[PDB]
Point group: D2
Chain length 31, copies 4
């Protein structure tokens, strides 16, 4: 269960790179 | 194209909301 | 904790609409 | 544009992998 709670944070971090990346996509699509 | 952008903006907003959801399950479990 | 385990599934389902939607975007970007 | 598509394909593959990650935390907790 700190097993769980720390995978959950790794998932968080990856979800944030993802959001960074859709936003950058969105920025290109826009130029 | 304004419609691809609008979707991307809306995907991001559903991401961010899942990110909040998840950080809170992280909260809980750390209890 | 079935509280937790069922939010986790709602999150799953939303992550799947998301993937459906990036793929459809990707399909438009491609025509 | 082939590069937007390639990214989108790669975001989706990181999603799908988070989806698997999460369904398994769901597994665990249902124990």
């Amino acid at each position: 269960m700190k097993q769980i709670e720390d995978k959950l944070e790794e998932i968080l971090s990856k979800l944030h790179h993802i959001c960074n990346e859709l936003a950058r996509i969105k920025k290109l699509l826009g130029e």
